[PDB]
Design a protein around this ligand. Structure first.
Ligand SMILES: Cc1cc(/C=C/C#N)cc(C)c1N1CC(=O)Nc2cnc(Nc3ccc(C#N)cc3)nc21
Lengths: 401, 550
């Protein structure tokens, strides 16, 4: 018996255009969906269904996988999966030594979807050069990628894990969309052994990657240490400190400023007054410590900004109010779009672990570039929200190491 | 015939009821025409009279199409109350994505909409009334049983009806291609003309069994087909003939129509340019007003007439071979390109000329053009091409490794077809010893719109100019321009304008700002320019004392 789902009142279903797909991905999708249809998971639909969400193929393993972009449908049923049947997020997960991520999305293909809701899950396989009408389908079962699926499957998931939780009370298991996160403080061999036990529990119900959150330390704003100091070195230091002033209560820069008093050549060497090198020292102290007074607000959205540093290095900050950084980081190590796509997935994963939310990303790339290419390196089953930005020129300079 | 195909269920939008528009009284002649038109349609099953129960109504008119009469039902209110449908098709096949075909025939479905049944539960909402003479009597009241002409669901339901009918024939004949466009079927194969007009008859017979009549062999058309503005041949394709009007005087309306046909010709005729003709349309003038052609607009018009003098054709797509795309810059932010598989038999050509930004350079524009050719490729062929680009591998890397945005263009190779793409200057990475340091600053009074711009140097020079009708952004660029005029060939420049630093660090070689273009001209003459930013109003060296002056 299906759980009835409603959209938000006065909201209609998603009508999101399908991005163009290459021949290889259209052929992968057509195979996958003839086999899903013959197994009853989806059904052809007719022109009386005006809804659409996009689909992609990712090869995340040598086998193609279908990825449905339910971002829009998720926004429109947000009361159902969040306030009506929300899955609580455990604060203990981020403290564990090891966290393993398991895909349990095949679970949802056994549960039926409320038949009055199926039309909202419509999607289109396009065809090259528009030579054939798109192949159109809707779901009959809980689909992967929809946040309504884990909320409905919640009850079942807790019966499945109830024996394993009872026998291991110091293991944390958190569901987010199509994944389980499993945290322990065990040594890694015992951790892996307990993961194998858990796979056995799941296999008796049809559900056939290792983080170490304990070692996700801050990326402090770092100040140079130098033999000499030109005026140009001091101006860059004052600018970097003055901007840091806006996050770190306490930063002082009016002892370094006096040294730059007249109108001097940029390359002129300026000996540091004994006054001044206490203030580098004091602000050094400051910048290697979290922000006082910045706390995660569960009602507000998470934002992630990413800057390209060069040489395969990228910096990022997560915040809800600009300059109130909840987290800062780097990601290191080819191809700019492949690297950025990897950084977006790393930041999202940490963010799921820490807050149970994925952030909205401010991406430093042209939209059409990103939309052409992100599919070819994306390996996750979820998709965060993103927009496209132009990186302020010096924000990049102040987060460099 | 009405075909035996299952009906598509249809709903009104939620919370809404069917229409009840009242019938205007008609002329005795239109009432007579409507009664004739209605009797014959009712005979064939297209319509059915209904009792007075049905409380819905849509106005119906009749107009003299010669000496024959047309029935016009005005579904404006029912359409407004009908649910939305998936839309009929998301793009038109481009000729350049079509494969070569030995035999092609076009089939036309007769009485397309009236040959498809309407969902029994929806017919009530299509009720209409032929009024009585000077509107005395209750009129005669009908409803539709097939898809009405002019209702919102007709195109969608017809073309999915046609799709389920064809799908058998398509499975049992995988190498016959059939494209549905409204009530046309375009049919293509590689069979010999004998074996091909066989399987067309087997197709026609399969269509008759579903209540769809077609033309006989006598009415099936022959190449070269005109279609969607194109001229399709079995082995090539072009755009249908483009004629350039020789006028003494050009109206806005004439120029708009010329820009449209040049834009359309640019799909297969390489090198068509429209920038100088479009500059004339900038502004606000009536469609009837005469526009004198500037010298550059006439030189563009002349060069286009030269390109179009003899016909050009495109070839079709061989799926077994790579796509090559070449881009050339034509100047002034105009780019042109050609896609081929064998050099140089173009599948198609195009142009790119986007101001993406206020300031850019040729390297950013070339990437933008590669991105739009790439997306187009995916759509038409499902595959990205290999690019041949007029930029050195080392210019490209130099730029994109230093630049703050990410980029990724597909496999490419340099090709020496000038003008080559280059960066025209580059800022120093560290301050220049033995060069004068300018501390520039600009300021503008928001009330007054007045501003001063000026500098002071480490060598003791100083200067302040005054500006009218200005802004903080404009004075801050004026200050940098001043330092570049008065400086020698090496110079360090210290600004508190993150705005100006942002622009100049991106190495623009073209801008909409007369100022930014003068600063660029200055940056190219220099041999060395270091440019640094210092926080304003923190009493930072020369910045506080040039802040005084402005
Ligand atoms: C989109 C289209 C339009 C017409 C318009 C006729 C009018 N008016 C005719 C056909 C057969 C197609 N279709 C249907 C489809 O689904 N795929 C096709 C793949 N390849 C070709 N190639 C091709 C090559 C030469 C000629 C000629 N002469 C026509 C078509 N055509 C295709």
């Amino acid at each position: 018996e299906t759980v009835p789902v409603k959209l938000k009142p006065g909201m209609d279903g998603p009508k999101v255009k399908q991005w163009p797909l290459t021949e290889e991905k259209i052929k992968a999708l057509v195979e996958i969906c003839t086999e899903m249809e013959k197994e009853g998971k989806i059904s052809k639909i007719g022109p009386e269904n005006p809804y659409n969400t996009p689909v992609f193929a990712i090869k995340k393993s040598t086998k193609w996988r279908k990825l449905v972009d339910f971002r829009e449908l998720n926004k429109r049923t947000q009361d159902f999966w969040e306030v009506q049947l929300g899955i609580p997020h455990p604060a203990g997960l981020k403290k564990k030594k090891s966290v393993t991520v398991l895909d349990v999305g095949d679970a949802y293909f056994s549960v039926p979807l409320d038949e009055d809701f199926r039309k909202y899950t419509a999607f289109t396989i396009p065809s090259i050069n528009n030579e054939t009408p798109g192949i159109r389908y809707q779901y009959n079962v809980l689909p992967q990628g929809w946040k309504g699926s884990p909320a409905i499957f919640q009850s079942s998931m807790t019966k499945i894990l109830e024996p394993f939780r009872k026998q291991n009370p110091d293991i944390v298991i958190y569901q987010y969309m199509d994944d389980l996160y499993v945290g322990s403080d065990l040594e890694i061999g015992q951790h892996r052994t307990k993961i194998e036990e858990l796979r056995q529990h799941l296999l008796r119900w049809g559900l056939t990657y290792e983080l170490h959150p304990d070692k996700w330390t801050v990326q402090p704003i770092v100040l140079p240490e130098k033999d000499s100091w030109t005026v140009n070195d001091i101006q860059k230091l004052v600018g970097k400190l003055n901007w840091a002033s806006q996050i770190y209560p306490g930063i002082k820069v009016r002892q370094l400023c006096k040294l730059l008093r007249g109108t001097k050549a940029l390359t002129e060497v300026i000996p540091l007054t004994e006054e001044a090198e206490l203030e580098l020292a004091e602000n050094r102290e400051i910048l290697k410590e979290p922000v006082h007074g910045v706390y995660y607000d569960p009602s507000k959205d998470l934002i992630a900004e990413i800057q390209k540093q060069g040489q395969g290095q990228w910096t990022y900050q997560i915040y809800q109010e600009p300059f109130k950084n909840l987290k800062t980081g780097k990601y290191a190590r080819t191809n700019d779009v492949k690297q950025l796509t990897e950084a977006v997935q790393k930041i999202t994963t940490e963010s799921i672990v820490i807050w149970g939310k994925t952030p909205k990303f401010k991406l430093p790339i042209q939209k059409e570039t990103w939309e052409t290419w992100w599919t070819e390196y994306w390996q996750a089953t979820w998709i965060p929200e993103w927009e496209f930005v132009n990186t302020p020129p010096l924000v990049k300079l102040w987060y460099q190491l | 015939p009405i075909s035996p195909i299952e009906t598509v269920p249809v709903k009104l939008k939620p919370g809404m009821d069917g229409p009840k528009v009242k019938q205007w009284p008609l002329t005795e002649e239109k009432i007579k025409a409507l009664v004739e038109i209605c009797t014959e349609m009712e005979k064939e099953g297209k319509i059915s009279k209904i009792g007075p129960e049905n409380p819905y109504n849509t106005p119906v008119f009749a107009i003299k199409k010669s000496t024959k009469w047309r029935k016009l039902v005005d579904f404006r209110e029912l359409n407004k109350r009908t649910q939305d449908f998936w839309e009929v098709q998301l793009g038109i096949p481009h000729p350049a994505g079509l494969k070569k075909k030995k035999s092609v025939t076009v089939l036309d479905v007769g009485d397309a909409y009236f040959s498809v049944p309407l969902d029994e539960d929806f017919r009530k909402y299509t009720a209409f009334t032929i009024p009585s003479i000077n509107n005395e009597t209750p009129g005669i009241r009908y409803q539709y049983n097939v898809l009405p002409q002019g209702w919102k669901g007709s195109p969608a339901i017809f073309q999915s009806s046609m799709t389920k009918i064809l799908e058998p024939f398509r499975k049992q004949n995988p190498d016959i291609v059939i494209y549905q466009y409204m009530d046309d079927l375009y049919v293509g194969s590689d069979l010999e003309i004998g074996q091909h007009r066989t399987k067309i008859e087997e197709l026609r017979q399969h269509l008759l069994r579903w209540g769809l009549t077609t033309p006989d062999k006598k009415h099936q058309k022959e190449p070269p087909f005109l279609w969607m503005g194109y001229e399709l041949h079995p082995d090539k394709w072009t755009v249908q003939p483009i004629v350039l009007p020789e006028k003494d005087s050009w109206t806005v309306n004439d120029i708009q129509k010329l820009v449209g046909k040049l834009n359309w010709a640019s799909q297969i005729y390489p090198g068509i340019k429209v920038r100088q003709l479009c500059k004339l349309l900038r502004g606000t003038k009536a469609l009837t007003e005469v526009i004198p052609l500037t010298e550059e607009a006439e030189l563009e018009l002349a060069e286009n007439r030269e390109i179009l003098k003899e016909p050009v054709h495109g070839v079709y797509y061989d799926p077994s071979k790579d796509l090559i795309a070449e881009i050339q810059k034509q100047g002034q932010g105009q780019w042109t390109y050609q896609i081929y598989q064998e050099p140089f038999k173009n599948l198609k050509t195009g142009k790119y000329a986007r101001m993406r930004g206020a300031h850019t350079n040729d390297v950013k524009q070339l990437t933008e053009a590669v991105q739009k050719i790439t997306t187009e490729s995916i759509v038409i062929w499902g595959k990205t091409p290999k690019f041949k680009l007029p930029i050195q591998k080392e210019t490209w890397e130099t730029w994109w490794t230093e630049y703050w945005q990410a980029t990724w263009i597909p496999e490419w190779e340099f090709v020496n077809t000038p003008p080559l793409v280059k960066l025209w200057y580059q800022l120093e990475k560290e301050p220049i010893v033995g060069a004068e340091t300018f501390y520039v600053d600009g300021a503008a009074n928001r009330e007054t719109k007045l501003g001063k711009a000026g500098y002071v140097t480490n060598r003791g020079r100083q200067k302040v100019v005054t500006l009218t009708d200005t802004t903080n952004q404009k004075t801050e660029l004026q200050a940098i321009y001043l330092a570049l005029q008065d400086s020698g060939l090496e110079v360090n420049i210290v600004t508190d304008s993150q705005y100006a630093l942002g622009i100049i660090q991106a190495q623009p070689d073209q801008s909409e700002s007369e100022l930014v273009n003068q600063i660029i001209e200055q940056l190219i003459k220099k041999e060395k320019v270091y440019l640094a930013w210092v926080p304003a109003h923190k009493g930072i060296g020369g910045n506080e004392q040039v802040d005084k002056l402005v």
